[PDB]
Amino acid sequence: SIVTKSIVNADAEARYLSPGELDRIKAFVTGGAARLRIAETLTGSRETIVKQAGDRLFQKRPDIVSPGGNAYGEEMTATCLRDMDYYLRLVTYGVVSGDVTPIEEIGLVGVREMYRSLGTPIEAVAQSVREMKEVASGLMSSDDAAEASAYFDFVIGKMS
Amino acid sequence: SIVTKSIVNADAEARYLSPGELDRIKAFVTGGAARLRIAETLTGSRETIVKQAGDRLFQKRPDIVSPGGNAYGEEMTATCLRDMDYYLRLVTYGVVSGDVTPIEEIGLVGVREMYRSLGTPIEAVAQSVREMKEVASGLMSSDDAAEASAYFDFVIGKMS
Amino acid sequence: SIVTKSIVNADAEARYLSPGELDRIKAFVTGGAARLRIAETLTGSRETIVKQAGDRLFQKRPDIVSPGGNAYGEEMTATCLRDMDYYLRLVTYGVVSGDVTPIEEIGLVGVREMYRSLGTPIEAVAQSVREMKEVASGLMSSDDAAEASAYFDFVIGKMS
Amino acid sequence: MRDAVTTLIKNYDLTGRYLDRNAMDELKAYFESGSARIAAAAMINANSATIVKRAAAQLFEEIPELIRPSGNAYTTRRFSACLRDMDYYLRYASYALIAADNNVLDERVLQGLRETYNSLGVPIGPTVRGIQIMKEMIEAMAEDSSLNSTDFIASPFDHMTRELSELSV
Amino acid sequence: MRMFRITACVPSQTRIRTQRELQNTYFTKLVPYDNWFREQQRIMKMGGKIVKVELATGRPGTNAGLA
Amino acid sequence: QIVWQNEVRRFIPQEKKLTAGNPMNFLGMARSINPAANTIPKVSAQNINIEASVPRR
Amino acid sequence: GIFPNTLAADVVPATIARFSQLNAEDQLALIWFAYLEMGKTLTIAAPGAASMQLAENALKEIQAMGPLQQTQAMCDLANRADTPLCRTYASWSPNIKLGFWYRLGELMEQGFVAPIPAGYQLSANANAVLATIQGLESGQQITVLRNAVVDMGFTAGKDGKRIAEPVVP
Amino acid sequence: GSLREDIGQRVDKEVTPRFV
Amino acid sequence: MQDAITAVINSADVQGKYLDGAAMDKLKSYFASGELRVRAASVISANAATIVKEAVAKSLLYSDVTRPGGNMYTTRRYAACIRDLDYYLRYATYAMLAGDASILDERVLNGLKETYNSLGVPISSTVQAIQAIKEVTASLVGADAGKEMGVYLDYICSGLS
Amino acid sequence: MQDAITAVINSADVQGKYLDGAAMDKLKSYFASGELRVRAASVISANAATIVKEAVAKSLLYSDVTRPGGNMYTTRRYAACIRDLDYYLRYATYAMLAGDASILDERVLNGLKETYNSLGVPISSTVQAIQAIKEVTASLVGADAGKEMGVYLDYICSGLS
Amino acid sequence: MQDAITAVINSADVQGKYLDGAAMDKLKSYFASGELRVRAASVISANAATIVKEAVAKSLLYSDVTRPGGNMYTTRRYAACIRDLDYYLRYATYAMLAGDASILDERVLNGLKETYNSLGVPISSTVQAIQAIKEVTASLVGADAGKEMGVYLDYICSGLS
Amino acid sequence: MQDAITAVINSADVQGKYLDGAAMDKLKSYFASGELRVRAASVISANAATIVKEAVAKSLLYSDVTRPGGNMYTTRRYAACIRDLDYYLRYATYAMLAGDASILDERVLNGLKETYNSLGVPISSTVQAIQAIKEVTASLVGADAGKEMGVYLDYICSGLS
Ligand SMILES: *[C@@H](C)[C@H]1/C(=C/c2[nH]c(/C=C3N=C(/C=C4\NC(=O)C(CC)=C4C)C(C)=C\3CCC(=O)O)c(CCC(=O)O)c2C)NC(=O)[C@@H]1C
Ligand SMILES: *[C@H](C)[C@H]1/C(=C/c2[nH]c(/C=C3N=C(/C=C4\NC(=O)C(CC)=C4C)C(C)=C\3CCC(=O)O)c(CCC(=O)O)c2C)NC(=O)[C@@H]1C
Ligand SMILES: *[C@H](C)[C@H]1/C(=C/c2[nH]c(/C=C3N=C(/C=C4\NC(=O)C(CC)=C4C)C(C)=C\3CCC(=O)O)c(CCC(=O)O)c2C)NC(=O)[C@@H]1C
Ligand SMILES: *[C@H](C)[C@H]1/C(=C/c2[nH]c(/C=C3N=C(/C=C4\NC(=O)C(CC)=C4C)C(C)=C\3CCC(=O)O)c(CCC(=O)O)c2C)NC(=O)[C@@H]1C
Ligand SMILES: *[C@H](C)[C@H]1/C(=C/c2[nH]c(/C=C3N=C(/C=C4\NC(=O)C(CC)=C4C)C(C)=C\3CCC(=O)O)c(CCC(=O)O)c2C)NC(=O)[C@@H]1C
Ligand SMILES: *[C@H](C)[C@H]1/C(=C/c2[nH]c(/C=C3N=C(/C=C4\NC(=O)C(CC)=C4C)C(C)=C\3CCC(=O)O)c(CCC(=O)O)c2C)NC(=O)[C@@H]1C
Ligand SMILES: *[C@H](C)[C@H]1/C(=C/c2[nH]c(/C=C3N=C(/C=C4\NC(=O)C(CC)=C4C)C(C)=C\3CCC(=O)O)c(CCC(=O)O)c2C)NC(=O)[C@@H]1C
Ligand SMILES: *[C@H](C)[C@H]1/C(=C/c2[nH]c(/C=C3N=C(/C=C4\NC(=O)C(CC)=C4C)C(C)=C\3CCC(=O)O)c(CCC(=O)O)c2C)NC(=O)[C@@H]1C
Ligand SMILES: *[C@H](C)[C@H]1/C(=C/c2[nH]c(/C=C3N=C(/C=C4\NC(=O)C(CC)=C4C)C(C)=C\3CCC(=O)O)c(CCC(=O)O)c2C)NC(=O)[C@@H]1C
Ligand SMILES: CC1=C(/C=C/C(C)=C/C=C/C(C)=C/C=C/C=C(C)/C=C/C=C(C)/C=C/C2=C(C)C(=O)CCC2(C)C)C(C)(C)CCC1=O
């Protein structure tokens, strides 16, 4: 989590954690109920979030669900929704941990390699994450929405 | 060209061009006329190559010319065919020079980056070049076809 | 500052900054009121802090004021109290920054060599900053005491 | 275990060589020293208990911390074990003296000795000092008695001292 | 970080190299401040001739805000 | 009431059960969305004038 | 290759199962008539979305053999028969197999491959299944066709069948 | 596949039999 | 590089004084701006690739610059140009989020104009594309945040110009 | 590494012999095969990404390997695995061009089994992926060059099991 | 390494599952104790040299270990032992903050036993030293933080033993 | 490494002892031998190349080792082998000067057997070559110095056993 990233930085310089790192960990710690509330809200409505996001995506990008598109066909669309589900779960992990390391190490490092091998248009993957972010933000309060949108934006940028 | 490539390969080991390199340059110079005509065959029928290949591609990849695709609309269809003509021009440069370098140094260094910024799928640009290769090969003799296919396939390989 | 180090760490990986870093920037900006409160309290009370710390240090380390000590006499006592004031300056500089970087750039990067070239026992200076800490930690509120204690303890650990 | 003759034979067999003049000279040197070596071993046999006791007493006088709390000779259990270890060293030193070769110490004393003492917390340095004390006592005893050759006596003890002690330089 | 822009000429003693070596001989390069003492020593003790040293990035008289 | 006959009749092999990550788990959702494929777009590269139609911004 | 939808009690699995019920003659004729129906009532092909180079050589061979051999090769593909081309076909991904059948149909329409027997008419069950497939959406249609042609060719382990469609002499 | 034939073994020179 | 906090710290330490009244005031002003600063930073980070993409589309593409002869011609020249714009956005966002431009000197403008003169990259088209970038950014965040971003991107442009 | 020519030369040199009729026959046979080897290698260089893609889709996708808990799960591990397949294909092509498997032992199979055992990489799945590469390459390049590529891919498989 | 949060996340990710209630309550437990860990870490960071000094002075000084013939004799070896103690204290604090001993198992213990048996460093004496560090730290950071730091120092000792 | 003087110093240091009569006696004995050791070292250094040449002619030349298939075949292997003989002679001279074999334990025999086995170097042949070096060196430096140098060369040989 944030503790691991700060620990790695402090150990890389053969030093104990600084006051700044300690206060950052402390803030992530005590203000940790909102993170779990956001994660619970995202996990509760994953079905609707992914379904609405997929509908929005296919409306914006019908080519991927048209002849010659990766998502063309029932099975291909099912796998696309599965990928979006993967990314929503990873976003929840990132929100909980106060860091983007778990998202990075589960679904971004070499993601371009994987999707180039699969033939999948990665920009449309970032767009599907955009739709998921929009739906989830609609499903939460303003501050929770901003906190989740930060990590959604991280994921979208890494595929844009 | 082959002479420039041989020069750099000789200077990499701090020596003179070996008799093998010099004899290969001799053969290239003497066979000059055959490629000086292969380039002319490609150049004179350029519009046929580009348009026939574009039709074959849009039959291969209907999604790109469909709404949401990268090339949908007459405007973007025309600019995609513009890219096809560009790459045919680079292939003619390649067959003339005897080397894949000017193709690489003009149209394949950072091509993925530029097309990422523009949104084009790259497998489809490779398909466009492959259709150009087939249409061009149909217009010429088998040996001439293979000689040009070397460079067409190089371009295909540097794209997908 | 915390902002500077966030920016340089981001630029190390060539990224726009991650959500936790911006969250900490927000938190530090909003807590600027309390941090400046602590800084003003230490600035206004600097002379008393230094005097009490020096008295309790000398009761703790009566050798440095004995003949042969680096701070022997009244002029050298004045220089040592001046160093205590300088590092109180650096504590107030650090607290308003949210990071330890100014303290290292001015006062800790090279302190060991400086005191050795002076003959000052740097562990006695650590003790002086300690006495400053346990004096200041009763002069302000309970949370403010700890918020300054972070920087006091960093200085002590970096002088140990 | 290898004695002086076995060591020489191993050296010559490694190269498939018959024993030459130098080999015969070395064997002659060992055989002529044999009587003195036997006498030294017999003298050690006649005084082994007192040698060990006096060496331990001198060591605990030189390093009194050993028999004080937290010392590794502290308590009768550890004291007896320490005297036992000194007895081991003297017996194997006598073996090495007879064999004119320290391989017996390598095989049956030193190999894994550092590991055992580290595991038990036995301090190596005082043990090496005790070995040296026993060596000096043996040398003085041999000088006092009617023994002609006494230069070989130091060889085993020094060997143990070099093999077990920490490297300082 | 402070960055110098050092120019140096490095001669070739003990060896007549036949490969291309001009790039190693007279070179201008950016050096982090922290490594410039060590690099100055290395270029000198190698036989180099440091023509020019400038403060390409950074300011003089800066007590804080150098990294 | 719990009836074991119903469960016996409803037996499914364990290896055939869907586990996490299987895209089959999104078959129902994919069917419900029923993505709309684009119409067959009529394009003729022959009738395009590249020079005129390409943007001249 | 891509995961196949085999038994789910829905229109796509139901139609796939029905296509699997049909005989080799019914199935092969059905895909020919579906090909004739592609672009108006069924979904078009998009061969650029398949690594069709893997089939290139195979297709060349079909375009070189004689008309009777061509028809026999297609019948072998539909009969689950063990031939080198059937194994080659089976080794491909579903998209490549379907694009391969598409190119076969294109060649037949162009005459380069042996056409259908003159005046051939689709049977009853095959026509009903084709009408069902025409009633489905484009995505459902592509899934149904993919699963229709995926099991053709030869794969070891599996076996069966008794009807066969040898030739039309 | 990488072990040379002369490494760690006796390499006998092969000569055609004298009766040939 | 220096932030406003480190800038006032540096001034006070150069003059060897505690945090004075004016120092407190300027720190307070930074603290009062450090909410729109972070909001603008987050918004810019969210959609930076699109910012540069739209700027290039509306300001550079389909003109002589991207045509044979222009300095963006070639798949390699185009890549170099787009990363240059992306770097400009990142470093301008850092500059905005810190209330200073010393980072622009120390990590962008370290000999950039001389490099472009040597390598022929135009010094006018770069400023035009940066105008487009700051326009899209300001339209994407707000008037005051956009004003800050435009100020710092113009600082970059002047360093180039 | 040794090619076929160098293998012949090494056997001769270890005998101290000039190249006799049989060695020249081996050299002639290799020269005869050279054109076929070069054609096949050009095809594989052309279609390497496709070969790997199709082999993975045939052997690994839509199985427990890619799902959570499998070794290919996560984009990082996916990328590492397809990278390894690219490595194996490239080295098999090298070996086919050389007509010698030695490069595989010196550069690929040395410590590879220990590597995969320390990493927990499943060996049978990797072997199946390599065999799928073999079948795809056979269908793409022919049945003779397909057979040679099969020899060297099976060599890689033999050193992994 | 993994901390408690990452332990929960990895346990959920290896199954492909979103976090359920039990995972949430484990994360709540970790957040509940995080303040304690930060304060204990701050105290230890301030006093690291002093804990090490007092633990050495209470366990190793004026013993056979420091006298001639002991493994702590000579200044190079003395400094080496103090250096190792600094590592042990610092990594115990790291693990304590993380809530997991994983960093110890990976940075400290994976090779250290072989290292110490190679160098001849006595493990009885160093275990005594780490235990003395345990009591000194327990005296400084209090009861709960003392026990928590205990856990990881005892972990280092058990890994050595 | 550790010579006679350094061995005495170590023995005294590990007991915290000043040098007593026996230690001074050992130092004086080494001093007495020093003249002979220096003379032998000078002569060997002047004649190392020819010592190696004669040893090679005695033990290695015109045998299967230098013929095709032998480990000294090819110029690179021959140069390596005479380089190894140079190593052994130089380090034996070092040990003779020091009057101690520890340098041989530290940087000659450590991992040497594994080195030669991995390279395929024949152990028996190199042992015979080192014996030849001992004989030639004895014939050059006289009986006594040959005895000492032979002690150290035989130490190397026993290491290879
Ligand atoms: C006090 C702690 C005890 C003691 C220690 C001691 N250690 C050494 C030497 C080394 N210790 C290490 C340790 C580590 N390697 C790693 O990677 C890690 C990080 C996780 C550690 C902790 C190493 C590498 C060395 C060898 C260094 C070298 O190359 O010289 C010594 C010196 C030993 C020597 O022979 O010089 C000592 C004294 N010794 C005691 O007696 C104390 C009980
Ligand atoms: C949906 C928005 C887009 C889309 C998706 C799509 N993906 C695949 C296939 C796969 N996707 C993955 C992805 C992941 N595996 C991981 O471990 C991670 C992180 C946890 C990710 C993101 C994988 C591995 C596959 C391979 C199949 C398998 O899971 O075994 C497909 C199918 C491709 C095919 O040809 O089968 C599709 C359709 N496609 C689009 O067009 C959308 C933009
Ligand atoms: C057609 C096969 C595919 C396709 C292409 C496509 N490209 C663009 C836009 C551009 N393409 C280039 C490429 C080059 N310019 C060069 O100088 C070189 C070297 C010869 C190359 C390769 C550039 C620079 C552009 C920008 C526009 C311009 O040329 O001025 C588009 C238009 C994108 C848009 O938003 O307008 C398209 C459609 N798209 C497909 O789907 C096909 C697979
Ligand atoms: C004699 C009238 C009194 C006396 C004196 C005495 N003791 C020693 C030596 C030793 N005493 C011990 C004692 C103990 N070992 C244990 O484990 C415990 C707890 C049960 C005890 C009390 C030991 C170990 C020694 C030997 C080591 C040493 O010198 O300390 C001496 C010296 C003997 C010598 O030969 O030099 C003397 C004079 N002890 C008594 O009990 C009497 C009251
Ligand atoms: C006396 C000078 C020092 C001393 C000794 C001491 N040793 C032990 C325990 C053991 N000693 C050995 C040693 C050997 N075993 C062998 O077989 C040989 C080779 C011939 C040797 C040298 C062993 C193995 C042990 C443990 C097993 C056993 O007891 O047989 C102790 C007891 C340790 C304890 O407390 O458990 C002691 C006290 N102590 C000193 O202070 C002197 C430096
Ligand atoms: C000979 C006609 C004259 C002459 C020569 C001379 N040269 C040097 C030193 C150098 N010369 C070069 C030049 C090159 N190196 C390259 O790699 C290339 C580009 C392919 C060139 C042209 C360089 C780089 C050096 C310095 C580095 C090096 O030599 O390796 C010397 C100086 C010798 C010295 O060590 O001072 C000399 C003498 N000098 C004359 O007087 C002739 C007229
Ligand atoms: C894009 C709007 C314009 C454009 C750009 C362009 N730039 C180059 C080459 C370089 N650009 C840089 C960039 C920087 N130097 C720095 O110190 C910083 C801070 C990180 C930056 C952003 C550099 C270093 C180079 C030279 C070396 C390199 O290749 O990177 C080119 C390449 C030109 C050529 O290849 O000849 C281009 C195309 N070109 C235009 O036409 C636009 C107006
Ligand atoms: C005297 C000039 C100064 C002084 C000395 C002092 N030293 C200690 C404690 C120790 N001294 C050493 C030193 C060494 N051990 C070695 O092995 C060697 C190398 C040969 C040296 C020089 C050690 C290790 C200690 C620790 C105790 C021990 O032996 O186990 C003290 C006591 C410190 C304490 O509080 O324990 C003192 C006073 N003090 C001065 O002020 C002088 C400048
Ligand atoms: C003839 C032109 C010159 C000449 C030759 C000469 N050589 C030797 C002895 C040896 N020559 C070799 C050389 C090689 N061995 C190899 O493996 C290779 C490549 C495969 C080479 C070139 C070797 C190893 C020897 C050592 C003897 C042995 O074969 O075991 C001699 C004999 C010298 C002596 O004193 O025995 C001679 C005469 N001598 C000249 O003067 C000519 C210029
Ligand atoms: C969109 C898209 C695509 C989809 C492409 C699609 C949908 C492709 C579908 C293509 C289809 C429907 C191909 C069918 C071809 C049938 C043939 C050649 C049968 C001929 C029968 C004969 C000769 C039988 C003769 C006969 C004989 C002799 C008898 O014995 C007696 C009678 C009988 C008639 C049986 C791709 C998959 C390419 C890529 C991905 C993607 O998105």
Residue numbers in the entry:
A (entry chain L), B (entry chain H), C (entry chain F): 2 to 161
D (entry chain o): 1 to 169
E (entry chain C): 1 to 67
F (entry chain P): 193 to 249
G (entry chain B): 10 to 178
H (entry chain A): 673 to 692
I (entry chain G), J (entry chain M), K (entry chain K), L (entry chain O): 1 to 161
Give passages from the manuscript:
Cyanobacteria use large antenna complexes called phycobilisomes (PBSs) for light harvesting. However, intense light triggers non-photochemical quenching, where the orange carotenoid protein (OCP) binds to PBS, dissipating excess energy as heat. In these massive macromolecular assemblies, light-absorbing phycocyanobilin (PCB) pigments are covalently bound to phycobiliproteins that are tethered together by linker proteins and organized into the PBS rods and core cylinders. Using cryo–electron microscopy, we unveiled the OCP-PBS complex structure at 1.6- to 2.1-angstrom resolution, showcasing its inherent flexibility.
The newly obtained reconstruction recapitulates the known OCP-PBS structure, consisting of a tri-cylindrical core composed of Apc proteins with six emanating rods composed of Cpc proteins. On each side of the core, one OCP dimer is wedged between the top and bottom cylinders, as previously reported. The core of the OCP-PBS complex displays an overall slight twisting motion, with the top cylinder and bottom cylinders moving in opposite directions around the central symmetry axis. Our analysis also revealed that one of the B-cylinder’s ApcA/B hexamers is lost in a subset of particles. While this could occur during cryo-EM sample preparation, it agrees with previously reported sample instability or heterogeneity and may give rise to the presence of spectroscopically active components in PBS samples that are distinct from the holo-complex. The calculations using the high-resolution structure confirm that, to achieve an efficient quenching, there is no need to quench the lowest energy state emitting at 680 nm, which is associated with ApcD and ApcE subunits. Instead, quenching of ApcA pigments emitting at 660 nm is enough to provide photoprotection, as suggested in earlier reports based on analyses of time resolved fluorescence data.
